[PDB]
């Protein structure tokens with residue numbers, strides 16, 4: 013048996029509209045995502061990835077079966093999103109991730125003039141494959 | 144069986160007004176890049192960007208990264224992207240992209256100074 | 270006992286003119302962040318930022334990320350950073366940072382608009 | 396077997412003009428980092444960064460974290476990264492990195508302040 017490491021990145025990006033939107037009061041557009049770090053086809057071993065949004069969103073249990081594993085929405089506030097990665101192999105248990113959706117730019121990055129809020133974290137999906 | 148994810152599309156920026164010399168209103172850059180950072184020149188020989196016949200030398204080509212073509216113009220048209228590979232037995236990949244210049248009704252004043260129209264795809268090998 | 274690498278420091282920006290009300294000339298933000306991004310709040314209870322005694326409320330506390338404190342002033346002084354951990358059986362980690370406001374004769378003479386001064390360190394706890 | 400994932404590469408930033416003293420245009424930082432927020436100095440003795448032979452002391456050696464080398468210049472060139480281990484019976488790992496300085500037209504129009512070229516690898520024990 014060999015140890016197999018699949019490095020991934022996950023989190024969300026966000027952009028401020030500049031003001032409140034008149035129709036719904038939304039202020040940001042954001043995209044929560046899960047990506048492989050390397051330029052590889054993650055669908056070779058991932059069956060699906062579900063993003064559990066806040067209950068106020070329509071169909072809050074989002075399911076992405078085809079890459080890219082990204083969900084783009086709008087809103088005005090920050091809430092926790094549960095990410096669960098399901099694998100094709102039935103012996104490989106799913107990975108559950110927790111991400112606080114970040115909309116508001118930190119003071120440090122605002123002074124640095126960064127144009128996009130980026131809240132990205134890392135994970136090492138570890139597998140044990142027979143040789 | 145090796146799958147290489149890519150994204151393709153264009154970015155564009157409005158001049159603010161029409162340019163008097165040629166009537167152009169936007170500068171745009173059509174591009175192809177990997178979904179995640181990698182040396183795509185290890186397996187891509189060159190990428191052709193077939194512009195509208197109005198442009199001089201409409202069949203542009205880029206032989207090394209970054210695979211991008213920057214131009215100006217006044218309207219939206221279809222660009223044909225043809226990706227050639229170092230492996231002489233790998234058939235080229237042809238993509239079609241509609242150049243986006245004008246912001247939609249959504250991102251009209253939503254702080255987007257540069258419009259983006261980008262799409263995910265996958266190149267499959269052997 | 271685990272070692273968690275961190276980066277601490279500050280960014281600063283000149284107003285462009287001395288503020289007449291209080292003579293302040295710069296806005297700055299002192300911060301602590303992990304070397305590689307991670308949820309520091311999983312093991313950090315709070316971080317205290319002790320400013321110069323002349324400030325109003327010189328002792329600031331941050332309990333949730335981003336662990337940053339923004340203020341204004343006219344000079345460079347030493348800030349004491351105390352990092353408290355969740356496990357109550359843990360002495361805090363004390364960092365010392367000299368706030369940097371003024372652009373050097375070469376480190377930012379290329380026309381830069383923001384000053385940055387940060388350093389690497391490690392937290393040995395638990 | 397123990398697997399230690401790492402990332403390596405460089406970040407670059409344009410000066411805004413060309414420095415008249417030496418013709419340099421960019422500042423860059425070549426580095427090696429752990430993938431997660433760990434302490435590599437528990438098993439890493441030193442990391443060598445072999446710059447182009449024109450630089451002064453081109454064989455830069457970093458014996459304590461962070462494993463970064465910041466310099467300036469005007470062109471892109473290959474850097475050889477060699478990672479030495481505390482265990483004397485572990486063979487060093489050699490990495491090759493092409494320094495990236497120049498920003499693409501796409502990222503320039505997007506207003507990105509920084510050029511990044513970073514890659515993933517693993518050290519197996």
Ligand SMILES: O=C(Nc1ccc(C(=O)N2CC(c3nccs3)C2)s1)[C@@H]1CCCN1
Pocket residue numbers: 036038066068069070086087088089090091
């Ligand atoms: O903000 C917070 N929770 C949020 C949950 C949903 C938010 C949002 O922005 N939404 C756009 C939207 C609509 N879809 C259709 C009509 S409305 C739902 S915010 C908290 C509480 C303490 C601090 N953070």
Ligand SMILES: O=C(Nc1ccc(C(=O)N2CC(c3nccs3)C2)s1)[C@@H]1CCCN1
Pocket residue numbers: 167195197198199215216217218219220
């Ligand atoms: O816009 C559209 N077709 C366009 C084709 C070329 C366009 C452009 O921007 N051009 C600058 C220019 C030159 N470059 C060098 C000499 S001329 C040509 S536009 C359509 C049809 C109706 C709405 N969409």
Ligand SMILES: O=C(Nc1ccc(C(=O)N2CC(c3nccs3)C2)s1)[C@@H]1CCCN1
Pocket residue numbers: 291321323324341342343344345346
């Ligand atoms: O400058 C220096 N120490 C500084 C201490 C406090 C500074 C500051 O900027 N502020 C306090 C504050 C106030 N606003 C109203 C009343 S107090 C804004 S500076 C040194 C000593 C030698 C050279 N560097």
Ligand SMILES: O=C(Nc1ccc(C(=O)N2CC(c3nccs3)C2)s1)[C@@H]1CCCN1
Pocket residue numbers: 417419447449450467468469470471472
């Ligand atoms: O550019 C290239 N190779 C380079 C090697 C070192 C470079 C550099 O920028 N610097 C050395 C240094 C000095 N300043 C004064 C004395 S030494 C600053 S460039 C080529 C040709 C096309 C791509 N590869």
